Symmetry: C4
């Protein structure tokens, strides 16, 4: 079975630094089959070689006896292990800009898992130059096949929003809610101490920002824009995404709490460094996150557990690897 | 006067472990007339002999002078007595499974009472084999007569939900809110210490789980399913029912508070073991519950009082004997 | 100018103890003109002589310099004075029952005032025997004239509710929201210590109920019923009205707070006994209340001030003299 | 490009003390270009000479490095400077009344700015005598041109509200929400200690009212009325505006918090006297305010920062220079 990834292209295209993004959420597959799963593309644009490389993850799972009706003596516990994951959406510093000038795609996937099954979400970031050739491509991810379909919308220059064409910025002024996708870029630096700005933007009891994760989020808005670096103090679009990421960390019911839990991240930690909540339910939100209390990014994969993403206390928390939401942008309709 | 109990049957039936359930809420009858009241059925499936047996209840009533306009010197008090109740929905361990293999029905009633009148709710759990003979039956409960009516819905295999047929699980994926009925099964065991899981799933200040009631809930979903044991950690449907039971204990206005009260459960208790709220109003929620702070189940019958079912403090609380609500199930429409 | 007071009568009338009530809210009149204002009726049913008698009130007003833009040195203060008010809705014990057997009306008025103007609300309680003669009457209250108009609704026995006829109690069961009017009856007695029941029904920090006002509320529901004594523990209709009175004391925007204030009730009190809130705005809620902390009822008239009617702390509070609202009653539509 | 300022006039006009007001919000202009910006009118009514005079402002800006993705080592700071602003809506005592008797207009502007751009809002208060000549005028404000357009509505005497004509006060009684514009008049006086009334009307922890700003607000309601002095204790319209000003100080999304900040007002203050919140976003609310903790009005201009206008703690707060909102007025429709 094949699934479609629609990437919208306007009639008028500006070349220079614009990248477009498409995504598709795939049906659930067993957790064991996600090992060594990597995107395999057949487009004329070679995928970036760094995405297929290994990223060390700390895998956190929960387990228990769980007999019918059993509420006690379950031996409910969490297990931390070091695992190698390839193809996840771990973007490196200046990878999007280099991929634009190299005409290379960025094809990666997110994992939304419970204890037994995973919903992969395949992402592809391609330069705007893919909006003229518009050659249909085929991507293989595990047992699934994805057809990249470029569609030329009836919009002249803007974004297709509910059958209307909105130009983020010559009509009258208007505000539109525009979709945005963000990825955390792990990069050490004295200017990238992220939680120093988390402490200023939000009512966050967050001490010791010197020892917390360093990096920034990079975002694509409207499915077609220049990359937005988050946070950027004098860029209100960037600060809107910053607000959305930390006020809605799972992104913008089948979820029942099994119990709270703590885990060692990484596995070699002398004490528990991450708080999580074990749950039962169909896969929903991402299982990929980054440990807060480590300058060097410790990537976490917690199938069946929701890591603590609330920032009101930075203790034993995490930040999401990917984030999707809506931000309000000024402009006009055409 | 006769009342109908509709039990829906699909055109395609799977035999193996499926049981169907029907219920009907009967008009109010005086409290004194509910004594020795037992279901009397005329079906081809003999009712389970254990339901008509005696279950010891602690009866908690409230009383006062209550002259017109009298607000003081009412001698407002509660009285605890040991009473024998037959035919209430007290299911034993593995009773539903044995009744399936024996082709026996489980006919029982719940009591929703105020100080003077009771609304009986008659339940019947029959094996799926009653969805082919579909012989109309007659059940007598006190002054009421109930006609069991099996109706073959136009659904192929699924459940009739608002004129649509939903198959809980080959169309597209969808989520549907499905009705569910649950009964507390009292059974001693080191794996059935229920409040050990209540403490983990909910923000519940609940100490000393060793001395609290032991057992599990058994549920039928969609009016047609295999029994669901609650809680089951790796069964998200079971954990959804678990969440609904303890977040909405009365199930999913004519109710005025007369005053808080405490009662000895059982009557021989040296101190008060249960907190309740005396009320005035037409009968609404169930008057049957089980004392929390006793490993051996102490069944409580409190006409005119609502027992403390909130779990945020397990002190002097109770759990419901029966629970009806809605849970979200994955599947498709046919 | 003349105003209408519609009193609805059903086609079928039950004689025995039923009284009907009508009311009309009159336009604002200057506060000084309300002195010695008494209802003057021209019906064939003589008004009860006790209503036109004097009831001692403690009058609480507020004053200040109040120059344009003046926010300081206003000398904002309250003044307590003993005044004689006639014709207000001060019902005596068993007055409604005696008026029924005597075929006498109870004609009285409520006062909703700000600092300068008053909205009188004229009430009339007549026995059900006024629903057959149905002779149109004329009542004079100050500068206003009121025509009592009896209208035979198309209802057989029930109450006209939104064009439908509801019979509070042979159709199917249903719940209807029914209008109700209540009056506080001041009567000393060891069974009428009202706040002893306020403490039990509501989460009310209310100590020393021995020294608080004694009496009960008497109510007419549906504009046609036997009198309902409030509170009556085993009468859920009575307890619904009890709940409405103390949860919605002003009854079931042009109101700006000038400032909190305390007053001596009665004027001879050695210290402040009542808390109030001075306001500016068009007349809205009643200015008549009864002091809480005095077994002998101290009637309060506070034009331009809202007395503390919240019961969460009984300190320096009051209770309303009259209350209008809605309660849910069981019955059927005809 | 020219923008319209519509000023509605009724068919019947009452001369005596009525003034009408119009306003227009202009597109954003760079912050540097707002210096020395003054309204230049071409009407037959000369603008009041005091508006074009200099008012000393304390200018509070925020700055930081703000590289793409930079969250730390931004050197985020605020800078206070003394600047001269002409033409802002700083009304003097009795200026509106003197302008009425002198047939002079009051033309001024408000500034809603972020760190880089400003939205000017041009106001004009003219005597009611401008509703007969109705000569179209031209006003120049910076790079913008404004055409004053007087329109004779189809209302006889009232205000045009959603296509209907409401007469604030011979039809039936009714309540209408009416627009109102208010300006803070700074005037020293023992009767103008504003926060003495703020403390009484609102639950405000506000000590030391002797050392807080002195003055009052002056308002025009319905775009046509006699001036309303705020607060006026016995004027419920005035107290409604008083409530709206302090409950909705910004008046009756593109706003992301960069961080809290404190500033010295005036620049010569030995310690920080004003709390603000630095933000990023398109210009929205006014950047003009008055320092609370100084009897002599200290006008503040904080482009890109929202001054603390919440009154629950008067510490380091401010009050708005201008306020627009809605108040409920009694009257009738014609
Ligand atoms: C995990 O998700 C799958 C697919 O939705 C579901 O079938 C399975 O029961 C889930 N496991 C849990 C909730 O433990
Ligand atoms: C109990 O319920 C019956 C039936 O609804 C009602 O008639 C009776 O008044 C109630 N008793 C109370 C509320 O004390
Ligand atoms: C009192 O009410 C009258 C009538 O609504 C009104 O005209 C008057 O201004 C009010 N006085 C106040 C609010 O002080
Ligand atoms: C200020 O507002 C202008 C106009 O809306 C906008 O272009 C600019 O980015 C804003 N500056 C910020 C938010 O720092």
């Amino acid at each position: 079975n094949v699934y479609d990834m629609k990437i919208e292209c306007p009639h008028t295209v500006s070349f220079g630094e614009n990248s477009v993004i498409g995504y598709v959420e795939l049906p659930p597959m067993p957790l064991a089959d996600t090992a060594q799963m990597v995107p395999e593309s057949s487009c004329s644009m070679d995928n970036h070689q760094s995405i297929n490389t290994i990223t060390k993850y700390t895998q956190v799972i929960w387990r228990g006896k769980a007999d019918p009706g059993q509420s006690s003596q379950n031996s409910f516990e969490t297990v931390s292990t070091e695992v190698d994951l390839k193809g996840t959406c771990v973007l490196k510093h200046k990878m999007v800009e280099e991929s634009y000038r190299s005409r290379k795609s960025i094809t990666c996937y997110d994992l939304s898992c419970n204890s037994t099954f995973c919903k992969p979400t395949l992402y592809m970031i391609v330069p705007i130059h893919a909006c003229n050739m518009m050659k249909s491509c085929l991507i293989a991810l595990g047992p699934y096949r994805v057809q990249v379909v470029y569609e030329r919308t009836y919009c002249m220059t803007g974004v297709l929003i509910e059958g209307k064409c909105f130009v983020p910025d010559h009509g009258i002024f208007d505000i539109a809610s525009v979709h945005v996708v963000c990825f955390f870029v792990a990069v050490k630096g004295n200017t990238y101490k992220l939680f120093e700005q988390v402490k200023k933007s939000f009512e966050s009891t967050c001490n010791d920002t010197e020892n917390k994760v360093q990096g920034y989020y990079i975002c694509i808005v409207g499915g077609n824009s220049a990359p937005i670096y988050v946070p950027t103090l004098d860029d209100f679009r960037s600060m809107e995404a910053f607000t959305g990421i930390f006020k809605s960390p799972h992104g913008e019911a089948s979820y029942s709490i099994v119990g709270p839990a703590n885990a060692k991240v990484p596995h070699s930690a002398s004490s528990d460094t991450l708080s999580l909540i074990a749950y039962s339910g169909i896969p929903s939100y991402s299982s990929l996150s980054i440990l807060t209390s480590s300058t060097d990014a410790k990537h976490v994969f917690s199938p069946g557990l929701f890591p603590k993403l609330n920032h009101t206390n930075c203790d034993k928390s995490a930040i999401p690897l990917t984030w999707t939401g809506m931000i309000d942008l000024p402009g006009y309709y055409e």
